[PDB]
Amino acid sequence: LYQLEN
Amino acid sequence: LYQLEN
Amino acid sequence: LYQLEN
Amino acid sequence: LYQLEN
Amino acid sequence: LYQLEN
Amino acid sequence: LYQLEN
Amino acid sequence: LYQLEN
Amino acid sequence: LYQLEN
């Protein structure tokens, strides 16, 4: 799992 | 921006 | 920014 | 687990 | 100006 | 991710 | 100016 | 992470 929020 | 991987 | 890995 | 909040 | 890359 | 606002 | 990288 | 605000 990899998750990025910008 | 929103990015998701699994 | 929010970033998560497992 | 690795987690970064900015 | 607005510029975005991912 | 790279982001520039001017 | 606003600049972000991750 | 690198962030610059001017």
Determination technique for this entry: X-ray
Using the Cβ of G5 and the Cβ atoms of chain A, whether some distance falls under 8 Å is answered with no
Q: List all residues 6 or more positions away from C4 whose beta carbon is below 8 Å from its beta carbon.
A: A1, A2, A3, D2, D3, D4
Residue written as token pair 């606003």:
G2
In G, minimum Cα distance to A4 occurs at G6
Tracing tokens 């699994």 back to the chain, one arrives at B6
Of E2, E5, E6, the CB nearest to F5: E2
Looking at residue C3, the DSSP 8-state letter turns out to be E
Q: State CA A1 to chain mean position distance.
A: 9
Burial of E5 per CB tally in 10 Å (0-12, 13-18, 19+): exposed
